[PDB]
Ligand binder design. Structure first.
Ligand SMILES: Nc1nc2c(ncn2[C@@H]2O[C@H](COP(=O)(O)OP(=O)(O)O)[C@@H](O)[C@H]2O)c(=O)[nH]1
Length: 193
């Protein structure tokens, strides 16, 4: 919700959250790869020895123009294994909607729950609960030979079925644009009404 009058843009921030290696970078890289050259900034990767953050912004093709303003989305993630919480907490500053990218691997079930607990904790620092921000779950890695049942994955990350759920194979693009359409429509929904 930072309004830029000078480029006449309204800006929305979408954070991909989830356990290390769940396919967040993959989501963002797939999306980036399909946005036309003149409608995207650079992909920015920031990294210290132990901390990381990846982000880019783009002008969605399918979004109108409330009284002369164009819509720019800013996609942010903390990719890789995490050793410190600070990047995760900071990534959430000014978030408008969240895609929780859950891993289908049975040896990642606990890390899914853990990552959802951490998201909740971090949102709580900004004074938000899980109801206060649109969240969509992507159960990624459906192509794993041991992939858990979606409903099992959802149960550890969304016990109450409060959030939409989509399946993905981010490496193949499958579920990637459906996921972003879903979160984007919930974001624009909440501003609108
Ligand atoms: N089998 C499978 N592998 C995936 C999928 N999405 C990503 N990966 C792989 O999982 C690893 C972790 O993905 P990455 O996007 O970097 O994880 P992040 O740390 O959440 O960004 C990479 O080797 C990806 O190529 C998927 O749908 N299926």
């Amino acid at each position: 919700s930072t309004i830029n009058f000078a480029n006449r843009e309204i800006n929305f921030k979408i954070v991909y959250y989830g356990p290390g290696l769940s396919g967040k970078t993959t989501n963002l890289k797939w999306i980036y790869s399909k946005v036309p050259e003149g409608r995207k900034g650079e992909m920015v990767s920031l990294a210290t020895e132990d901390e990381r953050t990846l982000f880019f912004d783009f002008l969605p093709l399918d979004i109108g123009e409330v009284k002369g303003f164009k819509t720019r989305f800013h996609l942010y993630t903390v990719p890789g294994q995490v050793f410190y919480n600070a990047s995760r907490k900071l990534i959430l500053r000014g978030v408008d909607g969240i895609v929780f990218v859950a891993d289908s691997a049975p040896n990642r079930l606990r890390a899914n729950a853990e990552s959802m607990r951490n998201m909740r904790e971090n949102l709580a620092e900004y004074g938000l609960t899980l109801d206060d921000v649109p969240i969509v779950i992507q159960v990624n890695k459906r192509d794993l030979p041991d992939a858990l049942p979606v409903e099992m994955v959802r149960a550890v990350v969304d016990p109450e079925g409060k959030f939409p759920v989509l399946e993905a194979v981010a490496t193949e693009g499958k579920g990637v644009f459906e996921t972003l359409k879903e979160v984007s429509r919930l974001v624009l929904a909440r501003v609108a009404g």
